[PDB]
């Protein structure tokens, strides 16, 4: 059968944490990095570490074009540890209201990156571990981990062309 949703949940933690680290580094000559970002669940050369890295690279030009608008919108929302679960949940639910596709799955990683970075840079709170759980649990509970598993896991995102 397919890999389990539990396996995809583990893989998602690895993809997200790698993604966050490599995304911050590619944006650093444009925000302090949360020191927790250098702690990964596994070595970064693992398969899921490579997937996270490649997804960060693929999105670079897209994410740069939307930075100013997202920065303004998050400054207005003022996410903190006290409201981040509510805002993450509502935004993620709306992102997936029409169904699942790989762009939305990868965009959820990007939103998690921006949310964690804002809470740290502006809220002075390290919240990366918590946002990691928000992302993993959201995917588990809204059938996304299952959808991923049934397509062969996260490596599928890099193999659609």
């Amino acid at each position: 059968g397919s890999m389990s949703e539990e396996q995809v949940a583990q893989d998602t933690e690895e993809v997200f944490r790698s993604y966050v680290f490599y995304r911050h580094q590619q944006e650093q000559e444009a925000a302090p990095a949360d020191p927790e970002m250098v702690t990964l669940p596994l070595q970064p050369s693992s398969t899921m570490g490579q997937v996270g890295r490649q997804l960060a690279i693929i999105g670079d030009d897209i994410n740069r074009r939307y930075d100013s608008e997202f920065q303004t919108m998050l400054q207005h929302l003022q996410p903190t540890a006290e409201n981040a679960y509510e805002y993450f949940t509502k935004i993620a639910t709306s992102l997936f209201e029409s169904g699942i596709n790989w762009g939305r799955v990868v965009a959820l990683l990007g939103f998690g990156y921006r949310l964690a970075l804002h809470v740290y840079q502006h809220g002075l709170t390290g919240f990366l571990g918590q946002v990691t759980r928000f992302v993993v649990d959201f995917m588990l509970h809204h059938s996304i981990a299952r959808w991923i598993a049934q397509r062969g896991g996260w490596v599928a995102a890099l193999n659609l062309g």
Partner: peptide, 22 residues
């Protein structure tokens, strides 16, 4: 309402990512 505006922007980014991945 403002949540919806942010989600709308993420949905736009997602379609750009999807196109690039495909």
């Amino acid at each position: 309402s403002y949540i919806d505006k942010i989600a709308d922007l993420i949905r736009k980014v997602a379609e750009e990512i999807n196109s690039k991945l495909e």
